[PDB]
Every structure is written in C-alpha cells, then in structure tokens.
C-alpha cells in the first residue's frame, strides 16, 4: 500500500556531489 521503489527493470542512476550539485558518475542499469 505505502510508497514502494522497486528497481526490477531498467533505470538511470547518478552519483552526485550534493553541495556542488555535480554529477560525478552516471549510468544505466539495463541487465544483470
């Protein structure tokens, strides 16, 4: 019922430096 984040299909992702708002790494997870 409550909020659910189920990453069982392709997604984008980002490693960010928060203070700087800087994307240090980014990618797509498409398949194991």
């Amino acid at each position: 019922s409550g909020p659910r984040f189920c990453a069982d299909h392709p997604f984008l992702f980002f490693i960010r430096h928060n203070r700087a708002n800087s994307i240090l790494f980014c990618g797509r997870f498409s398949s194991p």
Partner: protein, 329 residues
C-alpha cells in the same frame, strides 16, 4: 557553471544510452571533461571553440570562470600528462595544466618504446583507481607518432548512510525487456529517503545518501509500463535539477528494492565528441593545438574512457579514467 557541467553530463549520458541500446552504461562526466579541458588549454581558434561549446562554455568569460573555479568516504582525482621525451611543450601550457589540474608531465619514449610507454600509463591509472581500471589504453592506441597523452583518473568509495542488511537480499526477476527476465540479487530495506514522483515523465526519483551525506546516489526509475527510452529523451539537466528540489523530492518512508550490481564499461569517445560538435581537433590540417607545442602538425588521434562501479549492501565503489592521445600528423 554548475549548469554547464550538468548539461555536459546529461548530454553525454543521453548519447551513450542512445549509442549502446539494450546495454548497461556507466561513465564519469567529470573525468571526461577534465581530459577534454586539458586539451582545451592547448587549443586555439575553431579547434578550441568547438571543445568549449561541447562543454557548454559558450563565451570567453565562461571558459575563464570554469578554469578559475577549479582553484577553490574516499573521493580522489588525479591528472597527469605523458610527453615524448624528445619534444618540448610550451611552458604556458604545462603551467596551466599544473595550476588547474595539478597535472605534471612525465616523459616517455613513445618513438622508441611505445609499448612500454603504454604499459607505464596504464599502470599509473591502475594505481590511482585502486586496481579497478586496468588497461585504459588498448593495444595500438600508442604508437611511434604519439607525442602527448593527457590522463584523468577518479576513484570513489563510500558507505551508505543507511546500509542494507544482507539478510534480506534475495534473488528476484529483473525485466530486461517485455519478453525476457534475468535474476538479480535484490537488496531490501524500508527507510526514510528523499523521493520524488515525476508526473511529466512517469518515473520515480530516489536519493540514497552516502555517509556524511556529502554524496548521494540518485536512481531514476520509470513507472512499470513506461519505456526507459522515453525518459532518456525527455531528460535534461534543468529538469533533473528541478526534480531533486525539496518540493519534488521529499523525505518519505519507502520500501526500496535495489539490485546489487557491478559494471565495467569502456568507450571510444570520438563518435561522442563529434555529436557534441568537436571535429577539427581530429582532422589533419584543421586541428590547431599550437598552444601546447610549437610543433604544429598535432592532432587528436584517440580518446578513451573506462569505468567501474560496484553497488552492494554496504555502499558503492566507483572508478573511471580518461585518456587523450595527441599525435604527430
């Protein structure tokens, strides 16, 4: 400025996603832009203008501010230049790479010992990436015409602010497309995280902070019937920034299922940089790298990027390196 480098990162990601359909993608925009910026410091004319605009630096002012701004868990970056020992490079160029990127120039014999030189650079990158990026430069990327190699390496390792308990990791199906599913080890935890529902593109955006909350992992997950390619096409750095603001991405108790995974990717970047408009630097006769050397038949012969990431219950480890080969044409 922050908008410049974010625009570059998102454009990079969109091009790589589009050029590698149905394939995992991982890159470091910071690493690629550091390597490209060192080239920019040695370029002139239209060669330089194309590189600046690829980096979303559209005025002389924007270029100077970007470089001057450089002057002010583990996270570490390293830059180095590797130069043919029988050549001289302009003092102003070496000074700028030292000041802005802390890059020194190590001399190598590309002309007589190309393979030992390649091995030396690749060993340097391995050290700076804790062994995660081996053989950055592939065979034949260094040869008798090589004169200068500009290299960036980056390494990150961080623990989650709220780690997952491995007890609750279980194998589950991952839908790689509508008709195929493959097993993944899916981590599980219910905790309070910042989370946005993005109506415009029908996706959710989760933030998982690392310890100290200086860095975060952001995960953009399409709703269950939405093709990721539609989210990729809609994505811009301005939209992504809006979606992370407190009004969109608010603290929420949420059940998170996230796969454990490890990716290793490598890229020839020439087609990417061409899509961003960099053409002259690659072209004999048109390349103007005369701010690096008084020799003036230099061109950009190869640009490679290699990356590594591991996400698991304790945290994340990521590394990347970028090398630019400048050669005598």
């Amino acid at each position: 400025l922050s908008n410049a480098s974010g625009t570059f990162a998102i454009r990079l990601l969109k091009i790589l996603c589009q050029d590698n359909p149905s394939h995992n993608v991982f890159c470091s925009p910071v690493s690629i832009s550091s390597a490209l910026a060192m080239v920019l410091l040695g370029a002139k004319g239209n060669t330089a203008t194309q590189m600046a605009q690829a980096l979303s630096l559209n005025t002389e002012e924007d270029i100077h501010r970007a470089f001057q701004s450089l002057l002010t868990y583990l996270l570490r970056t390293a830059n180095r230049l590797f130069g043919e020992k029988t050549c001289q490079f302009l003092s102003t160029f070496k000074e700028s790479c030292l000041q802005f990127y802390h890059a020194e120039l190590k001399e190598l014999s590309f002309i007589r010992a190309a393979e030992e030189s390649r091995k030396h650079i690749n060993t340097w990158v391995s050290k700076k990436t804790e062994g995660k990026i081996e053989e950055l430069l592939p065979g034949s990327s260094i040869d008798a015409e090589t004169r200068l190699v500009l290299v960036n390496a980056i390494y990150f390792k961080g623990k989650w602010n709220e780690p997952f308990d491995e007890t609750y990791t279980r194998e589950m199906p991952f839908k790689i497309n509508q008709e195929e599913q493959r097993p993944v080890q899916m981590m599980y935890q219910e905790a309070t995280f910042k989370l946005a529902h993005v109506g415009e593109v029908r996706a959710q955006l989760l933030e998982l902070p690392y310890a100290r909350k200086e860095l975060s992992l952001l995960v953009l997950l399409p709703d269950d019937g939405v093709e990721l390619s539609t989210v990729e096409k809609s994505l811009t750095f301005e939209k992504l920034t809006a979606w992370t603001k407190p009004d969109c991405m608010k603290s929420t108790e949420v059940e998170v299922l996230l796969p454990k995974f490890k990716l290793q990717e490598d890229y020839d970047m020439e087609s990417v940089l061409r899509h961003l408009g960099i053409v002259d630097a690659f072209q004999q006769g048109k390349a103007d790298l005369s701010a690096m050397s008084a020799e003036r038949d230099l061109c950009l012969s190869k640009f490679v990027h290699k990356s590594f990431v591991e996400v698991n219950e304790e945290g994340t480890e990521a590394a990347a390196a970028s090398a630019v080969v400048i050669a005598a044409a």
